[PDB]
């Protein structure tokens, strides 16, 4: 149900976090800086805005 400079995060069904329709896990997902904090993305860590 949200989006970052790298995209939109949606809560699926069966309750998985998805991004680009991808159910991001602890394995294709990392925590990347965002202003004063962090936010989770997947395989697009270098994707300029």
């Amino acid at each position: 149900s949200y989006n970052t400079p790298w995209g939109k995060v949606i809560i699926n069904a069966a309750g998985q976090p998805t991004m680009n329709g991808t159910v991001m896990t602890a394995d294709n997902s990392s925590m990347v800086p965002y202003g004063r904090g962090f936010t989770r993305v997947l395989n697009s860590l270098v994707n300029n805005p």
Binding site: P17, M31, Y34, R36, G37, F38, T39
Partner: protein, 93 residues
């Protein structure tokens, strides 16, 4: 209504605190300091988004590093997940 939701929510908050805290290298260097973190968790306790919203910059910093690592327990209730998909938390070592 909010019957018994309040207690679980306070409880769950304190459980997030202790999971973040368990991942500190030197949690006693920050003993009296306070940090406010705004957290977004998935339906199963997985970290989604974390940002600080007040308090000590040094503590806020270490507490974000520890938040990257913590294993946060699964919300035990619809009401609790309703709160912790987005919610601010006072973190105090």
């Amino acid at each position: 209504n909010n019957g018994a939701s309040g207690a679980d929510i306070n409880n769950y908050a304190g459980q997030i605190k202790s999971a973040i805290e368990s991942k500190f290298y030197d949690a006693s260097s920050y003993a009296g300091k306070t940090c406010t973190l705004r957290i977004k968790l998935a339906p199963d306790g997985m970290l989604l988004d974390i940002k600080p919203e007040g308090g000590d910059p040094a503590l806020c910093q270490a507490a974000l590093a520890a938040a990257k690592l913590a294993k946060i327990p699964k919300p035990p209730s619809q009401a609790v997940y309703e709160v912790f998909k987005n919610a601010p938390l006072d973190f105090k070592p």
